[PDB]
Amino acid sequence: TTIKVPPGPLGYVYARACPSEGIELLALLSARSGDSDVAVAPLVVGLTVESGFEANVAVVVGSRTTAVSLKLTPSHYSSSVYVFHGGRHLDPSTQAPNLTRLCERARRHFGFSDYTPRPGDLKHETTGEALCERLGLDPDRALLYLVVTEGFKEAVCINNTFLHLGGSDKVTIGGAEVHRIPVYPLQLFMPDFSRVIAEPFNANHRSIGEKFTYPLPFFNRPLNRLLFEAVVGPAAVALRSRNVDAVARAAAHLAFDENHEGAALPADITFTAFAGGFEQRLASVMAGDAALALESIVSMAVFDEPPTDISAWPLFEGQDTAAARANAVGAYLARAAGLVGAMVFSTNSALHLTEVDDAGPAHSKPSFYRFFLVPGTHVAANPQVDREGHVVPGFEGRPTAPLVGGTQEFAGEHLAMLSGFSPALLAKMLFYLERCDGAVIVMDVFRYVADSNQTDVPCNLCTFDTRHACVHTTLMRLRARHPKFASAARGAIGVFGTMNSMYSDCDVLGNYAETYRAATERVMAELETLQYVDQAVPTAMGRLETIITNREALHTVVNNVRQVVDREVEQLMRNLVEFKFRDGLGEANHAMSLTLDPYACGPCPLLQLLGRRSNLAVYQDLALSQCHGVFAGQSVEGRNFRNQFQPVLRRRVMDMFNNGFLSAKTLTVALSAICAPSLTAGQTAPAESSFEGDVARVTLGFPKELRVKSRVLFSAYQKPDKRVDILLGPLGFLLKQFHAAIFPNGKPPGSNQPNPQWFWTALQRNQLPARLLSREDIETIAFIKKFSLDYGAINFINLAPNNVSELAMYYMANQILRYCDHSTYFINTLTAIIAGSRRPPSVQAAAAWSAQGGAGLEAGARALMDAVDAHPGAWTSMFASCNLLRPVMAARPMVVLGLSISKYVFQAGNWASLMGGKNACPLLIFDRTRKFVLACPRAGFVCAASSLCEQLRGIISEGGAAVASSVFVATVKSLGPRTQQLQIEDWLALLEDEYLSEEMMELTARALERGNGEWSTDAALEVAHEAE
Ligand SMILES: [Hg+2]
Ligand SMILES: [Hg+2]
Ligand SMILES: [Hg+2]
Ligand SMILES: [Hg+2]
Ligand SMILES: [Zn+2]
C-alpha cells in the first residue's frame, strides 16, 4: 500500500578506539594511501556499523512555517564510510609513494581545481583531536569516520551540515564500543529554505528562523578534503566539470530542492577543445546535468538490498578460525583485480568515455546516435574553450591532442584522473592493478630497479628504495596493456556492475519460453541424479572417473544424457502446443539485469567507484540520445537555453522508465512525534521530540535496474559445410579424457601408452595399424561416429562441448532448433570469463610487496613468497572461461561487459563487447557469433550460497482466517494423493497445532467424498476458504 521509513539525521560521525585484530581485514576491504591519515572504507554491518543499522531513512532536511514543522526526504546510506582521522591504522592499499603529490600535479595538468578551505573559516573548524577530547579518546589510538546518506555527502563538504553534539549515543560493533554524533542540515534553522547555503557561518542570515539559535557548521578539513577527492572528484571528471567545488554545489542543489529542474552544473563550465561545434558542447552539459540529476533520483531512493554483514559472508566458513580469515578476503579481492584491470585497459571503458562527439544528423529526421560519449582520457590536457568555442585563460599555449590516433601517453597522472584525483582511491586502484597482467604472450622488475640507481629516473615520486611499488613502475610493467584510443565512431560502453537478480535468462537459448528454463533444470537435475554432473561446477567430473571404466560405460553415459534430453524436449515441445515455434525462437534473446542498488556493489570503495562511473556513463548516453530532438527547431544559442530546456531533456529521460532498458519502480511514502535537534536550546542540549512533520513529496519514482539483452538467433554465422573431426566433435572431450578406459590396447606401434590424438587421427585416415581394433572396439568406434554424425547434422552451436553439462545443453538446444526446422546459421553464444585468484605464480609478481626495496629487493620478494601465508593480501588474479552461464549468474556476480544502448521511443540494452582486444582481457576472442562477460562470483563469498514443515508452519504464523484452507493447498501442491496417507500424527508433525491437524483430517476426508473415493482435486479448498 504505502512504504514506511524512519525519520533520521542525514548522517553520523562514528568515533571509536583503534580496534586490534580485524583491522588487517578492514584495511584489505578499504582504500588508503600510505602518505595520508584519511581512508575510505565500505559500509559493512559488523565492521563499520552496528547490527540494527537501517540503510533506508527519511532525513530531516529543513523546516516549514504554519509554529515550525520538519521536512523529511527519503534516502539511503552511502555504500562506503569516510575515515577522516585514523587512516594511519589501516595498512596502505599500496606501498606506492607520494600519491597525494601525484594527484596534486596531475590535477593541475588537466585543469581541475583543488580543495581550498577559506582562511576565515579555519577558526571554526572542528578537529579530530577536538572530538576525540569530547569523546575521551586517544587521538593516536582512534578512528573517526562519516556515515552519510547518498543524498547529502556533498552537502557535508560544503559546510552545510552541523553536529548535534547533544544527540550523542553509543552502539556496539564486534563487541567494541563506538561513539556516534548525529549530523543534520543547517537549513533546519531556516524555515522554508530549499537552497544550498553559501557562508554557512553567518549566524545573522535573514532566512534563519527568528529566536532560533543557529548552530556551528560542522567544518572539518581532512573530511572535506576527502569528500572532494573521493566523492565529488569522480563526478567532476565524469561530467567534465573542472571546477570541482561547483560540482559539489550542484549535487547539493538537487538534494535540497526536489522541485529543481534546469541547469545545475556551473553556468560557465568550460569545454575540452579537439553553428560550429556549438551544439556538440551544449549537448554535453545538458547531458551532464541530465546524468547528475538522474543519479540524484537514485540517491533519494530506497532499495531492498541490505548492507553487507561480515558475519554472513560464507567466505569465512571454516577458513575463519584464526585471524587469518584475512586471507579469504585477500584472495577474494584479488579476483576482482582482474575485473578492474579490464575497466582500466578497455579502450571503451566507462572510465574513459568522458568527452562527447557530434556526428551530425542522419534534417529534422530522428538522430538518436548523433551525440555520444567517446574516450577523452588522452585529451583532458587540451585547451578549455567556453560556450562559444573560445579558449579561456590559462589554457592559451597548451597543445591540442587529436581525439583519434597520435602518440598517446598513459602515465600515473591519468590513472589518478580515472580515480577522481583521489589519492585515497587511486591507492586501491593500484592494489588491483598490481594483481594484474596474467600475460602469456609477452618485464624484469628486479632488473629494472637495479639498473636504475642514480641513473636519473623520469619520476619525482619514488626513490631507489621504493621503485618496486611506484606507480610509474607498475605502469611500466603493464605498458603493453595501455589504452590506445584509435576508434572515431560511436562505440559501446564498458560497464562494471553487479547482476544481483535471483533470475536471469542466459540458458543456451536464452528466454525461449512447462518453460524452457524448467526443462533445462530438470535435465540438469536428472544428470545430477545419474551422478554425471555437479550443477554448480559444470567443469566437474562428478563420479565420471568411476562410471566410465570400460567402453561399455561410455555407451551407457552417452545414451543416458541423449535419452534424458530427448525425453524432456519431447515433453516441453508437446506442452507448448497444447505458441508459435518458428516465430518464437527468432524472438527470444539472452538476458540479464544490472542493479542500481547501492548495496549490490562489491565491499570496496574502488569496486564501487567503477559501478558509479559506469552508471553515470549510461545515464549520459541516454540523455545524449534525446538532445537532438530537444534542439530541433529552436534558437539553440539563447543566452540561457540550458535553464529553458533542461526541464524537457530531463522529462524525456524520465520517460524511459520501464520502457525497454531502464527498469523503474514507484513507491508511495506514508505520512504521519519526531525527535530532532532543538531550534532554540542549541546543538548541545538534547533532542527535541516535539516536532511533527511529513515528507514533501509522497511519491518516489526511480530507476531500479538495467535490462541488458542479446538476440539469440541471427555472413559469418554460416555453418561451414565441412564435417567436424570426431576429436573436436560432441564427444571429443570424453574420448580424449577416457581414452585409456575405452580403447585399452589403443596405443600406437612403438608406444605402450594409449594416445587418443594419435589413435583417432590414424583411425580417421585409415592409417591405423592393420587389425588392431578389437572385435568390440569397432562397435564402439561405430557408436561414437554415429553420435558425432547425428549431433553434427543438427548442431548449430559453433562450440565444442567441454563437459557433460555443456554436451547436454547444446544437444538439447540443437534438438529444439531441429524441431523448429532451424537452418544455415550458427546461433549466438555467451561466454563467461570467471575471475579467480591464487598465490603469486613467481617471485616477480611479488616485487611490489617486498618489505625490502633497495639492493635487498629481490631477496625481499623471495622472503615474501617463502612466507606467503603470513601475507593475506598476497594473491593474484587468473582467468577461466565458461560457456555455460546459468551457474555463473547463479552467483549473482559483479560483471564487466560492453553495453550498447539503442533507442528506436523504446530502449534496448544490447550486449556488446570490450574494446582493446586481449588488452582488456587476454581471454577475449574476436568472433561476431559470441559475446563475453568478465565475472566475479558473490554468492558463496559475500552473499548467501546459491523445508515444508517450515512453509506450512510459516503460513500458520503470518496468516488470517483461512489458515486451514491455505495450508491444505500447500500440502497438496507438495504431495499428490500422498496427502491421503497422512494420518493425524503426520499432520501434527507438519503443523505443531492439534486443531489445524484435525481440520486437515476433515478436509482430506471431504476431498475424498468429492472424488467418490479417488483423490484428485481441492475444490474443497475454495469452498472452506469461504470464512470471509
Ligand atoms: Hg591500536
Ligand atoms: Hg528524543
Ligand atoms: Hg562455470
Ligand atoms: Hg579477464
Ligand atoms: Zn616512480
- Of the listed ligands, the closest to the CA of 881 is 3
Which three three-digit cell numbers place residue 300? 533519494
Cβ < 5 A residues, ion ligand 4: 338, 833, 879, 921, 934
Closest CA to 30 of 604, 610, 611, 609: 604
d(CA 4, CA 104): 45
- Element holding 380 (H helix, E strand): none
d(CA 635, CA 631): 8
Distance 648 CA to ligand 1 centre (A): 55
- Of the listed ligands, the closest to the CA of 893 is 3
Residue 180 neighbours by CB under 8 Å, 6+ apart: 12, 13, 14, 15, 147, 168, 169, 170, 171
Distance 50 CA to ligand 2 centre (A): 20
- Of the listed ligands, the closest to the CA of 463 is 5
Asked if 503 and 890 touch (Cβ cutoff 8 Å), the reply is no
Residue 491 neighbours by CB under 8 Å, 6+ apart: 348, 374, 900, 912, 915
Distance 726 CA to ligand 2 centre (A): 77
Closest CA to 703 of 667, 679, 734, 742: 667
E strands along 883-1027, which residues? 894-903, 907-912, 930-936
Q: What is the DSSP string of 959-999?
A: --S-HHHHHHHHHHTTSSGGGGT--HHHHHHHSS-HHHHHH
3-state secondary structure of 464: coil
Tell the residue number behind the cell numbers 604472450, with chain if given.
441
- Of the listed ligands, the closest to the CA of 935 is 4
Distance 689 CA to ligand 2 centre (A): 5
Distance from CA of residue 99 to its chain's centroid?
26
- Give burial (CB, 10 Å; 0-12/13-18/19+) of 776: exposed
Distance 112 CA to ligand 3 centre (A): 44
Tell the residue number behind the cell numbers 576472442, with chain if given.
925
Q: CA distances (Å), 870 to each of 322, 327, 534, 865, 892, in order?
A: 12, 9, 34, 9, 31
Closest CA to 613 of 230, 153, 1028: 230
Distance 938 CA to ligand 3 centre (A): 14
Asked if 548 and 532 touch (Cβ cutoff 8 Å), the reply is no
Residue type, 73: T
Distance 464 CA to ligand 5 centre (A): 9
d(CA 347, CA 915): 5
d(CA 214, CA 235): 32
Distance 11 CA to ligand 2 centre (A): 17
Distance 934 CA to ligand 4 centre (A): 6
- Of the listed ligands, the closest to the CA of 466 is 5
3-state secondary structure of 523: helix
Calculate helix-pair angle for 423-433, 326-345, nearest 10 degrees.
100
Distance 329 CA to ligand 1 centre (A): 21
- Element holding 59 (H helix, E strand): strand 56-65
- Of the listed ligands, the closest to the CA of 920 is 4
Which three three-digit cell numbers place residue 886? 546459468
- Of the listed ligands, the closest to the CA of 23 is 1
Give a three-class secondary structure readout of 689-733.
CCCCCEECCCEEEEEEEEEEEEECCCCCCECCCCCCCHHHCCCHH
- Of the listed ligands, the closest to the CA of 438 is 4
Distance 88 CA to ligand 1 centre (A): 10
- Element holding 841 (H helix, E strand): none
d(CA 1017, CA 1000): 15
Domains of the chain and any CATH numbers: 1-506+589-714+828-946 (no CATH), 507-588+715-827 (1.20.190.40), 947-1028 (1.10.150.560)
- Of the listed ligands, the closest to the CA of 678 is 2
Q: CA distances (Å), 573 to each of 500, 568, 582, 812, 900, in order?
A: 31, 9, 12, 12, 34
- What per-residue string of b and e applies to 780-809 under the rule 16 or more CB within 10 Å gives b? bbebbeebbeebeeebbbbbbbbbbbbbbb
Angle at CA of residue 131, ends 128 and 136, nearest 5°? 120
- Of the listed ligands, the closest to the CA of 677 is 2
- Of the listed ligands, the closest to the CA of 99 is 5
Distance from CA of residue 258 to its chain's centroid?
28
Cβ < 5 A residues, ion ligand 3: 538, 882, 887
Distance 299 CA to ligand 1 centre (A): 35
Q: CA distances (Å), 661 to each of 141, 506, 653, 707, 905, in order?
A: 49, 17, 12, 5, 11
Q: What is the DSSP string of 145-190?
A: EEEEBTTTHHHHHTT-EEE-GGG-EEEEETTEEEEEEEEEEGGGGS
Give a three-class secondary structure readout of 526-585.
HHHHCCCCCCCCCCCCCCHHHHCCCHHHHHHHHHHHHHHHHHHHHHHHHHHHCCCHHHHH
Distance 334 CA to ligand 4 centre (A): 12
- Element holding 838 (H helix, E strand): strand 829-838
What DSSP state is assigned to residue 5?
A: -
What DSSP state is assigned to residue 410?
A: -
Number of Cβ atoms within 10 Å of the Cβ of 642:
20
- Of the listed ligands, the closest to the CA of 141 is 1
Provide the resolution (angstroms): 3.0
Distance 477 CA to ligand 5 centre (A): 12
Asked if 201 and 159 touch (Cβ cutoff 8 Å), the reply is yes
E strands along 583-658, which residues? 589-595
Distance 490 CA to ligand 1 centre (A): 53
Method by which the coordinates were obtained:
X-ray
3-state secondary structure of 301: coil
d(CA 671, CA 1027): 33
Angle at CA of residue 351, ends 55 and 502, nearest 5°? 45
Closest CA to 703 of 759, 771, 773, 622: 622
Q: What is the DSSP string of 202-269?
A: -TT-TTSPTT-----B---HHHHHHHIIIIIHHHHHHTT-S-HHHHHHHHHHHHH-TT--S--S-TT-
Q: How many CA atoms lie within 13 A of 670 on its CB side?
A: 7
Closest CA to 830 of 808, 805, 803, 798: 798
d(CA 380, CA 398): 11
Asked if 674 and 661 touch (Cβ cutoff 8 Å), the reply is no
Q: Tell me how far apart the terminal alpha carbons of the chain are, to the nearest angstrom.
A: 21
Closest CA to 278 of 387, 400, 402, 364: 387
Asked if 644 and 929 touch (Cβ cutoff 8 Å), the reply is no
Distance 438 CA to ligand 4 centre (A): 8
Q: CA distances (Å), 758 to each of 272, 768, 774, 801, 871, in order?
A: 62, 9, 17, 21, 46
Distance 15 CA to ligand 1 centre (A): 14
Number of Cβ atoms within 10 Å of the Cβ of 375:
25
3-state secondary structure of 810: helix
Asked if 84 and 153 touch (Cβ cutoff 8 Å), the reply is no
User: What sections of 363-422 are H helices per DSSP?
Assistant: 412-418
Distance 338 CA to ligand 4 centre (A): 5
Residue 678 neighbours by CB under 8 Å, 6+ apart: 166, 685, 686, 687, 688
3-state secondary structure of 593: strand
Distance 20 CA to ligand 1 centre (A): 5
Closest CA to 379 of 346, 351, 408, 416: 408
Cβ < 5 A residues, ion ligand 2: 675, 687, 689
d(CA 639, CA 651): 22
Backbone φ, ψ for residue 853 (5° rounding): -115, -15
Asked if 71 and 61 touch (Cβ cutoff 8 Å), the reply is yes
Distance 186 CA to ligand 2 centre (A): 19
Distance 524 CA to ligand 3 centre (A): 14
Distance 881 CA to ligand 3 centre (A): 8
Closest CA to 239 of 296, 290, 301, 298: 290
- Of the listed ligands, the closest to the CA of 469 is 5
Which three three-digit cell numbers place residue 898? 560492453
Number of Cβ atoms within 10 Å of the Cβ of 395:
17
The two counts, helices (H) then strands (E), for the chain are: 31, 24
